[PDB]
Amino acid sequence: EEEEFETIERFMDCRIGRKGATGATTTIYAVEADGDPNAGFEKNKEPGEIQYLIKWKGWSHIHNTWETEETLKQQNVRGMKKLDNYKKKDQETKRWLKNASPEDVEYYNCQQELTDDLHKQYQIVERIIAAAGYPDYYCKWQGLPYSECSWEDGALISKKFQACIDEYFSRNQSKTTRPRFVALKKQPSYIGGHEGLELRDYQLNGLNWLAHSWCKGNSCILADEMGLGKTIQTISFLNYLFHEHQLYGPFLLVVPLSTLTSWQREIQTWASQMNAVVYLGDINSRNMIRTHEWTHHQTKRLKFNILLTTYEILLKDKAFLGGLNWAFIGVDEAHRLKNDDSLLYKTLIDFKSNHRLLITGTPLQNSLKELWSLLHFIMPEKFSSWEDFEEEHGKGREYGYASLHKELEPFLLRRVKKDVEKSLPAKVEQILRMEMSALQKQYYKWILTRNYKALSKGSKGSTSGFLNIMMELKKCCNHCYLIKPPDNNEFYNKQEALQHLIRSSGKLILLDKLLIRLRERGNRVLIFSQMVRMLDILAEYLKYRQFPFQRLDGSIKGELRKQALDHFNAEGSEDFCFLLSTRAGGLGINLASADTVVIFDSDWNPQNDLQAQARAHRIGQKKQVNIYRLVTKGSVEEDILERAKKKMPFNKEELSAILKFGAEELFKEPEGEEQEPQEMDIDEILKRAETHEKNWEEIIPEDQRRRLEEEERQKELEEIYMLPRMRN
């Protein structure tokens, strides 16, 4: 029934327009009715007005009224105090916008452009929730949760989109909600959609996998190598039980909130003949879900084909969601289910479900307990304990490799990039091994001679003792300034900083020409380094080079982190560089926008290198990916590579020998200064590079240790003595 008047809700509008506007002129329903009495206005041409009309309480954005705002005061509407807040926030707004940097001003302009479009998008209905039929067409708007669902008389919505909405209204009356082997592997792409022809061969085989698995009654772990097979082949497989067989039970898909918009957009584009109760929002929104869309026909005759819920909400309403005999439970990013102590794992186990599918974006290499948990969730039977499993999982056996990740009947696809991609050019890992700069040599000598007293222990040393030294020396594989920064009084002079950069960093001499060559071509660059402080040097270096760039590390807040990634991933992205980190590989980010990447640093785990490559090896890439790794003939990573290749920092004797073999002889020899081994700048390294798919007193020139022991005993003695006996 009706209610009383006189309340404001919210102020999100600001405009300039001709006087005398009434109703909802710029809204689509009023545009059809009156066009616009403000049409043809210009800010200065006519005596108009700077409006900021208001979103009104008890009425939707489709009912957003535009009037002479003098009428607002003329009606004594409650809630005018928000109007005063609007000016003060707006007055602060221009004081920042008019003085910020033009890049940030245009950034805020893009933020406004996203903003009002999001505001404009609120107007569009999504569904009416079926004296007029389902009286007054209780309906949802785009963006708002179900709490904001409201009514219409059929006088403005009936014109705008009820023509197609009635077809969805008619869908309400439409009737909705083990066999032998089936004639699979036909060409059903006609069922895909109104342009449903884009299914590739491997995606079709994945559907053929899923159907075969249910024909055997088995369950599935969708272990696709983080390709496109996350969503497209998953939603299409549910068509097997509905649009071919009409065996349409209730389907659950629990997807994370970050990916929910994608899942909800592709459940309509593909499998369009489906309904989807998005189970989001506050308690009111879910109450509206239950009373009005959960069971349209009668008691327990569910009318939802699929419902999307976050993992966060599934734990809150575990009772209502778990009371139904599910035909299908789907979980996206399923590496969250790697632990049996997880509450989601424990509660999702107890859900009675006919079929179960897990989607993961990792090779799930982790130890037996992670696999045991995942196998238990998809199949609760015949995999219950180690006692009945030890004969098969018992590792340490070469004959056991015939079963380890081979003999698994609850099949995982594990279908790698190398199987699906068939037109990518060959790849070679470029290793730019080179001599050491003079400054690096001196600092490398500085570190080694400092730690002689620890190195003398040899086999009786400490593993943590060496690791600190090796971690310290790795700062010499990186550039010097991690050890001791340059003098500020000279470094600040850009008239000399260019000479400082080029003389200190031989590593850039070949890259300089590649940078110019590919900037003319339009390429983009991603850079990886472990040391966050070393990344800081790159940010300062890039700010001096003035190339546009972004950064990605764990110290960045979520909103800025997501926008930085989206800025580089947007169509026609202009940013040139990206300070990346290995830990970002678990976020599912896309690297296909940049075809050139530099591996500046080195890492002790090849899995991190694989994670960096996996996000760049996107299926469908036509160009040859450009990759470069830097080696400086010191802190020898090749000592690991020659051993790692038989199976792809572990043994105390080995690690001591690495220091005794790495830089074995080219210490501070009497050869003197100004050696400067630069003479391989260009076209030497390009042609000659290979490609593929003693105790310390005997070693170290002990003369320097006199020169350090007799000087450190001076540095750390004045620092004691240089303070007065008395105050003042």
């Binding site: 009706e2 009425w59 009912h63 009224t65 007054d136 009514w151 219409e152 008389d153 006088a155």
Partner: peptide
């Protein structure tokens, strides 16, 4: 009618 006239 519910709408604003």
């Amino acid at each position: 009618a519910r709408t604003k006239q």
